[PDB]
């Protein structure tokens, strides 16, 4: 069972935990309620196993994504903020956090991906994915690569499958059709093509993760990388110097990079929801609350009206809003999490050469529908 | 008829238009609504015109004395904010834009008048209007002038006729009565008198616009001006050493400027209410919004406390205070335009001689009455 | 009778009245009602014998403590925050200001007690009671003293006393035993004993009280203080490179010092009761408002969330933030007048010599109790 009393919290570990923890401190200095904050691993997959059987966090921290499933499953309680505090946050940040008309968790940041480069070894990034390869010859004769990004997760490589045409489900008359897949698409080939081409020409590796592509552009190992705000903190540690850039263009079209709102739920098994609900509204969506976790690891645009103005001055920020345009939040429907599943196993197969861009995306189409 | 599912809105000239443009494209950004910022010749005269037919602006930008007007002609929709909206700004600000228990726009900006004087021409601008004729002399004889406004708007005038006893309409027991009106008394006969003097002793010229007045001051030609906040933008441009003081003294009374709060009014006809109330709370009425709107034109002292500390300790800021405090909030009543229209017509024909200062005042007093 | 249509304000010697002063011109400026503000002196004793008649100030500022008690007396009328102004203040506050379910004054900060020494005389502060009079020898020589602070009113002598046991009134099962007094204790006696060996010892003296210590700290005679937020200003004045640090410990167990939250009340007898709580909600309790207020003399840590970044990273509110963590937030019950009383007379005579510790606290814990 959940502990009474207290509050357990989980967030990812790209994330800024000791920032939240130092806030779940202060917390505990007001109310004497114990905040402890956790970072375990797999916790989006972890999660809906514990929360069914009524254990788990008291908090859960992901993308709004995940959020529509778990709400489905019967996992979250239903925020209930009053109008002054909805007022505090953007209203679109709140439809990511909708679920069948019902408020199930709470919005903290707008988070996108963009053209990290370095200034020195490339003072002018490629604006297309197009001129990469020849931009990598040149690199390679130096010792050096021009682009290096996580290969393991679909989010990624996302941008570049979706810049043609390649998309998730439609929507259509205010509705998304769980049915229609467009991840098969002429657009989504072209883009997944592109990428094979360049681990085939040797400009990328398969065996690329998070980890080995910050080494490198934090290392000046690679003239580019693909991240979110998250990752600036480590790229400062470095010395590194780097420019957040709107994403290179695919077929004369801009990148479209799924758009995710860090939300923070709570688990419908918990004995302190009153608790969790005072912490989140009264501590965390605070300006002195998202400066602890900005501080520690970048949140992005935040949803906190009161706190713009101290990020919408910040070059990366503007950056990060433009490629965020040029994307689309993605849909918090129960079906997401069977369309990652399907594109990682595509990605992962294509790029390992096990199967052809066309046999992958085939099978990652009909596994993502119903 | 108003074209539904974008927004059209009308605002002032001397405003900040380009940056209110900014914000609107920042609405499009986040909800894909197109906002247009036109700015028409005579819009206060223009719109209830439009209005009254189903056609005209979604959203109309003035200040709050034309409002209780349009509201009686049944042209103004009852804008609805929630406790929660309306606890963002200062009560006062409310008052204002209320017209028969209803709230009829929302308030922006309060706008008062101020003595602006080039600090290399006048280190020490005179305290009281008395000394303006001496101070000329001196001038003239350095081939400048010492004081230069608009005496084409009754606005620029009234607060050296409001100075020793001068009144719009007479307010007794919570209201105004409108067959009361104090523009024929003692006090605004010395006060336009002075002002006929000043011209008949070639101290001023009753041709004298809004635009002839803000050349020869930003040209460096006049010592001095009369102006409200808008006007900063243009003196920074022009590299003026310039300082926003307190309007002079007339037979030791202080000068009385017709305080004005620039308003935002939703058109009854327009099928899109919901999204300019979306607008105005969510987008304009925030620190980001009226930042982008005051860096193009400053807007004085902001009705939003939220945003207070980032113009609150400005000395111009201070100044258009100190102005509004000796001043009075305008009636926002249906006879305030009957009201502007007789003293315009009394102002000119005095300052021309066209007629005596007697006659015409008298004229105005029975013109502003029903 | 109490003026209608003018606010009247008692306010603390030691407070910022002037900065509450400039908010009251401020509120006279865009309302045009005079703002009286007033320290009268012994405050806390003189408001309920003239609010018992129906005279009185509008409003009354101390610590809660006291407006339980005023309340009860059926001197404080119930204050009416929407929620949407409740959200703009930390909850713990809020809790701080109820008596019976109702909320009878407003909380604008949080003030603790801390060690403030001169860098230049002493480096390194001591971390332990039990080292000072040792510290004091060495001062001595350099003709100056180790520690000086006003052993006149119990709330300095307070955190000690509490250190290893001392306590006003029994706290469990979410509320007060009245009957249940902890000045009497081991704990409460250990703490007094120590305080009075100081004296004995010629490394205190008895009749020090708030004045006699503040010059002597800021006149560089003594090298350590114990004070509030409010105090630092006069520091300032003084340019002594002064240091706000945790409180020494006592028995190796911190010293407990008794947190106070300034707060507002609304005499019951007022007829301006819409206008106080005009002025409190928008313009005291607002960013502007607490700036005029700390820039007198600070506040401390406010209560007032969207201010929290302007003093959060300032060391010296750390400090007081660290002090009160340490301590205990004050009972607003009635029976806390008592019980200061109690100690107050406890402390003087056990100081004086007049009583033994034993005597004095002993007489002290049966006159606290009913
Ligand atoms: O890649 C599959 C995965 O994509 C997104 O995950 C992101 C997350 O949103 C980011 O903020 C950061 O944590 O990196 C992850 C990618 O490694 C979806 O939100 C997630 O649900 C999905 O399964
Ligand atoms: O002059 C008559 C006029 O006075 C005010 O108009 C002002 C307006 O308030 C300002 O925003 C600025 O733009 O200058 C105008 C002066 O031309 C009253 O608001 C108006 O209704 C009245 O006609
Ligand atoms: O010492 C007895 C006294 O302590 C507290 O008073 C504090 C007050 O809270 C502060 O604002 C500051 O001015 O100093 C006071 C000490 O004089 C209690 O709040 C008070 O009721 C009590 O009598
Ligand atoms: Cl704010
Ligand atoms: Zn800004
Ligand atoms: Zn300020
Ligand atoms: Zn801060």
Redesign the interface.
């Known amino acids: 069972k959940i502990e009474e009393g207290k509050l357990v919290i989980w967030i990812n570990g790209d994330k800024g935990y000791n920032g939240l923890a130092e806030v779940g401190k202060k917390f505990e ?3 004497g309620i114990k905040v402890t904050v956790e970072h375990p691993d797999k916790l989006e997959e972890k999660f809906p196993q514990v929360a069914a059987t009524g254990d788990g966090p008291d908090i859960i921290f992901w993308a709004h994504d995940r959020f529509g499933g778990y709400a489905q499953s019967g996992l979250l309680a239903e925020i209930t903020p ?4 909805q ?1 505090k946050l ?3 940040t709140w439809d990511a956090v909708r679920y069948n008309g019902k408020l199930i968790a709470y919005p903290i940041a707008v988070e996108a991906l963009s053209l990290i480069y370095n200034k020195d070894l490339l003072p002018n990034p490629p604006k297309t994915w197009e001129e990469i390869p020849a931009l990598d010859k040149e690199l390679k004769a130096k010792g050096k690569s021009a682009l290096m990004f996580n290969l393991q997760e679909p989010y990624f490589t996302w941008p570049l499958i979706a810049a043609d045409g390649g998309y998730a489900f439609k929507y259509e008359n205010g509705k998304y059709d769980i049915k229609d897949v467009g991840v098969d698409n002429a657009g989504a080939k072209a883009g997944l093509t592109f990428l094979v081409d360049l681990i085939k020409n040797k400009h990328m590796n398969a065996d690329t993760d998070y980890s080995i592509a910050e080494a490198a552009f934090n290392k000046g190992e690679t003239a580019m990388t693909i991240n979110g705000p998250w990752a600036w903190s480590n790229i400062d540690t470095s010395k590194v110097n780097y420019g957040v850039t709107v994403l290179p263009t695919f077929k004369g079209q801009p990148s479209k990079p799924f758009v995710g709102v860090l939300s923070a739920g709570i688990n419908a098994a918990s004995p302190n929801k009153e608790l969790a609900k ?1 912490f989140l ?2 501590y965390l969506l ?3 609350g998202l ?1 602890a976790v900005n501080k520690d690891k970048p949140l992005g645009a935040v949803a906190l ?2 706190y ?2 101290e990020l ?1 001055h910040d070059p990366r920020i503007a950056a990060t809003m433009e490629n965020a ?1 040029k994307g689309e939040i993605m849909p918090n429907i129960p079906q997401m999490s069977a369309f990652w599943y399907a594109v990682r196993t595509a990605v992962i197969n294509a790029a390992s050469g096990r199967q052809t861009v066309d046999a992958a995306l085939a099978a990652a189409q009909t596994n993502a529908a119903a």
């Open positions: 200095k007001d109310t009053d109008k002054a505090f007022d953007y209203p679109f005072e509204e009264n605070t300006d002195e400066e009206k009161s713009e103005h919408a345009q």
